[PDB]
Amino acid sequence: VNPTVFFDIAVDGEPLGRVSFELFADKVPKTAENFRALSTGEKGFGYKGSCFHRIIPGFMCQGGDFTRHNGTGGKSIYGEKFEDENFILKHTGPGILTMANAGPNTNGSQFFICTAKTEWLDGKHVVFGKVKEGMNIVEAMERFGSRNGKTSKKITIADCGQLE
């Protein structure tokens, strides 16, 4: 049944706390597996060490760009990009884990953790999980963001993996 993975977050190299996520493999197997594998690193590349390069309070935290650290990079475990699996799930509120993209069928490795209801993304972005514990750590991250998204401190995934 549904996998759980975690990220331990750091701020300027100082441990903050752990966020953990349920990945909805029961409804988005392919999109779930991508995130799971990136989190454990089992493919030889993944989230560990990457940063959250874009954070907008009241909206979301974005990370996943583990190759260019700035929104222009990242890749999936399938190839540069894979299809939108489906849109069964709707951005219903804070906590939601959904994929970033640059158009139809362009899912790589980037994602948003929403800090608010973002229903306008429905049918555009694949929701594939949600925060399970540490929503508060995400709320602490959120404070280092800004209106244009730039972080005032350096937010990173010091470690990540599968809890089970």
Residues with catalytic function: 54, 59, 62, 101, 112, 121, 125
Strand order, beta sheet including 54-56? 54-56, 60-63, 111-114, 96-99, 127-133, 14-23, 4-11, 155-162
C-alpha gyration radius of the chain: 14
Q: For residues 65 and 18, what is the distance between their CA atoms, to the nearest angstrom?
A: 19
